[PDB]
Nucleic acid binder design. Structure first.
Lengths: 113, 113
DNA sequence: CAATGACGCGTAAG
DNA sequence: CTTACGCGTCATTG
């Protein structure tokens, strides 16, 4: 049962769309920035192909590299509009649309143990 | 035997004090910042112990966290005087004396912002 | 050129 | 306490 959950990493509240069931995509609560590494990962790209596209394409624009600390939070972060376009271009939007069409009130529930 | 060596990791020149002979403490050449994680490892502290010390004490001052890259370079980096203070507070300055007292000659770098 | 396992850090969760 | 996580270098391979 895929769904959007609340989580906090290094004091940073995020929305975590769980699906797969072990796959996930994170969106920040404060600025709605999304993890582009998660998106490319959902598109089926392996590690070298991901490092390639991130270096060559994604990081040519406004972005934030996160190299610490918790693994699942790490990656390259970009504005939501940039992440949505990246998902559409890699034909992965249908698997990812809940995290893009999410408009929160208070507040998303905690994840599973 | 145990002594000071000069290495380069990810294009970053450091001074490295080796002893054990597998233990080490790195001091950066460009700003004399020292690896606080190496220091606490030189003391008897294991992972959760130094995790608490780094988070509750060391991180509350001027610091830089490094994850990824060459493994042994990783850790929490702090200015040299803060490193000397930390080494004293945790009763390990004497064993690590050469990495604090080493001097190439002319001349030490100023306090970074 | 590209791939990939080792490394080991800061974090999180059991 | 224990494990799990993913990253970016380095050495090594094809």
């Amino acid at each position: 049962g895929p769904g959007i959950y609340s989580a906090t990493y290094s004091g940073i509240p995020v929305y975590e769309y769980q699906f797969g069931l072990k796959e996930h995509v994170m969106r920040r609560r404060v600025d709605d920035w999304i993890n582009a590494t998660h998106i490319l990962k959902a598109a089926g790209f392996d590690k070298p192909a991901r490092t390639r596209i991130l270096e060559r394409e994604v990081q040519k624009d406004q972005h934030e590299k996160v190299q610490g600390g918790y693994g699942k939070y790490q990656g390259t972060w970009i504005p939501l509009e940039a992440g949505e376009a990246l998902a559409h271009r890699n034909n992965i939007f249908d698997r990812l649309r809940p995290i893009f069409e999410f408009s929160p009130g208070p507040d998303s529930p905690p994840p599973a143990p």
